[PDB]
């Protein structure tokens, strides 16, 4: 199957929408991190390949993605720096894992209907 760019943005944007809706655990990754200005200057030692939910919107919106998993594949990828990066007890921590839950939730019935 080949997917066009109009195709992949009407099925996958409602599931970016409902990680950006959810409060408070969306908001550390609304935006791409600033290790100075968050004061984790370690951050790229650390997070080779940064991602973020407005990345993410970019790229959607400007046809980066060729196939589904690819936007999977980027939603992972913020998830997993974020389990990378932060200590299990941490604010952050946490909100990655209930994002994880949540996004789950709402791609296994989208890429059903893909
Ligand atoms: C995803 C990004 C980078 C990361 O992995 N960890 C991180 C560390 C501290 C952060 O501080 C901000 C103020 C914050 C904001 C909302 C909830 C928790 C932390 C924010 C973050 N968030």
Redesign the pocket.
Known sequence: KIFKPEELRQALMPTLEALYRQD?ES???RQP?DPQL???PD?FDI?KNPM?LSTIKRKLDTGQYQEPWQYVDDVWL?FN??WL??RKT???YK?CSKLAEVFEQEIDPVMQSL
């Open positions: 408070p908001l550390p990754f991190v968050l004061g984790i951050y997070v973020d913020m720096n974020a990066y932060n941490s604010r952050v909100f």
